Amino acid sequence: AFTVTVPKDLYVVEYGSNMTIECKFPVEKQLDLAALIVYWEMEDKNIIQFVHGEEDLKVQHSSYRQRARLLKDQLSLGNAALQITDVKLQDAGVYRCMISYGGADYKRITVKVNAPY
Amino acid sequence: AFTVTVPKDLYVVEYGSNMTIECKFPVEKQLDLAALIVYWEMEDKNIIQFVHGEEDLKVQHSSYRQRARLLKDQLSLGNAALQITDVKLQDAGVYRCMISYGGADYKRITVKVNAPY
Ligand SMILES: CC(=O)NCCNCc1cc(C)c(OCc2cccc(-c3cccc(COc4cc(OCc5cncc(C#N)c5)c(CNCCNC(C)=O)cc4C)c3C)c2C)cc1OCc1cncc(C#N)c1
Numbered sequence: 001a002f003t004v005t006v007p008k009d010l011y012v013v014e015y016g017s018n019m020t021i022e023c024k025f026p027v028e029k030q031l032d033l034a035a036l037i038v039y040w041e042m043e044d045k046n047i048i049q050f051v052h053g054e055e056d057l058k059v060q061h062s063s064y065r066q067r068a069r070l071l072k073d074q075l076s077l078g079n080a081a082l083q084i085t086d087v088k089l090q091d092a093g094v095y096r097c098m099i100s101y102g103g104a105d106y107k108r109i110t111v112k113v114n115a116p117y
Numbered sequence: 118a119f120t121v122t123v124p125k126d127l128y129v130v131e132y133g134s135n136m137t138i139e140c141k142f143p144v145e146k147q148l149d150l151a152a153l154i155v156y157w158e159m160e161d162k163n164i165i166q167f168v169h170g171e172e173d174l175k176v177q178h179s180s181y182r183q184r185a186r187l188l189k190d191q192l193s194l195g196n197a198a199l200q201i202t203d204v205k206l207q208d209a210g211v212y213r214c215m216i217s218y219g220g221a222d223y224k225r226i227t228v229k230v231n232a233p234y
Contacts, residue, residue, distance in 0.1 A: 001173065037221045051118075051220045100217035103168055104154045 002026065002103030004080075009109055013087055015116045020071070020083045021109050023097035027078040037100040038070060038080045042093050048082060063090060089113050119143070121214065121222035130204050132232035137188070137200040140214035140224050144195035154217040155187060155197045160210055165199060180207060206230050 004025045013019045021040075033053040040048035045061035048070045060068065064084070071081040080097055092113045098106040123140050130136040138157075150170040157165035162178040165187045172187070181201060188198040197214055209230040215223040 001168075037217065039221065098215070098221065098223075100154070100221045104156065104215070104217045104221070106215075 002101065002105055004097065004099050004105040004107050006097075006107045006109055009107065011109065011111045013111065013113055015087060015089060015113050017087055018083070018085045019087055019091075019111070020081055021095060021097070021111070022074070023080040023082075023099065023107060023109075024078050025080065025099045025101050025105075027101075031076050031078075035101065036075075037098075038075070039098040040068075040070070040080075040082050040095065041098070042091075042095045047095070063088070087113055089115060119218065119220040119222055121216050121224050123224045123226055126225065127227045127229070129229045129231060130208075132204060132206065132230055134204050135200065135202045136204055136208070136228065137198050138212055138214070138226050138228070139191075139196055139198050140216070140226070142195050142197065142216045142218050142222075144193070148193050152218060153192070154215075155192070156215040157185075157187070157197075157199050158213045158215070159208075164212070204230055206232070 004023055007022055011019060011021060038048060038050040046059050047064050047068050049059050050070055067085050069083050071083055074081040080099055084091055092111055095109045096106050121140055121142055128136060155165060155167040163176050164178060164181055164185050166173045166176060167187050184202045186200050188200055191198045197216060201208055209228050212226045213223055
């Protein structure tokens with residue numbers, strides 16, 4: 001059965017830093033963008049919406065715009081990686097990564113931000 | 118863009134009655150069982166795991182085992198229909214139906230159970 005996995009299901013980070021939430025999925029030989037879908041959401045806020053290689057700035061929630069990107073370099077090697085930069089205390093919470101690729105699966109990732117000084 | 122739709126996001130049903138939760142996806146004609154995944158969750162309790170035709174009925178909350186069924190007769194009309202016979206008060210809460218077909222989407226449905234006397 002297709003099982004997405006999370007190396008680290010608990011990221012503690014510092015206010016203002018850079019964070020990279022990883023989700024991994026199985027890839028045999030190369031990666032087929034046809035039949036790959038990657039969706040990242042926090043508390044129902046749309047963070048990453050990647051469908052057969054197309055993405056649209058218009059659908060990103062306003063608190064994640066210009067900070068939250070899906071790294072395409074890791075994707076090619078089975079790693080849906082969310083990278084939030086300039087982290088706010090408001091980014092603390094449970095995130096879900098939902099992948100369709102051979103089959104489907106999702107995983108929760110928890111994040112706390114410790115506060116400045 | 119592939120979108121899942123609920124004719125109703127909230128159902129009020131009576132203790133002891135039968136209830137069908139419906140969530141619809143688009144279908145051209147020949148249902149490609151090979152391209153279809155239907156997953157039903159209730160508070161993260163795996164209810165339905167239906168993947169390329171086969172149900173891993175191993176993992177199915179015994180809370181619903183033999184009472185929570187995927188009507189695999191409406192799927193062909195683009196209706197992932199969850200039916201729970203003999204509704205207990207425990208069946209009250211938020212259900213989530215996740216479909217991967219052309220692409221992918223999910224929707225929440227709430228169930229309020231009442232028991233008039
Ligand atoms: C204009 C337009 O309206 N368009 C789109 C509009 N929205 C944009 C959008 C746009 C897009 C693209 C998307 O994609 C999702 C997506 C992406 C990728 C995959 C899936 C998906 C599809 C089918 C099934 C499943 C999940 O199956 C399973 C889950 C399972 O269980 C996982 C699990 C269970 N329990 C706890 C955890 C944890 N932790 C994990 C298991 C069993 N396990 C694995 C197997 N065995 C082992 C060893 O594990 C099996 C299946 C098949 C998923 C995630 C989904 C839904 C979702 C989208 O909106 C979501 C959304 C946003 N806001 C509000 C609501 C509401 N209401 C909904």
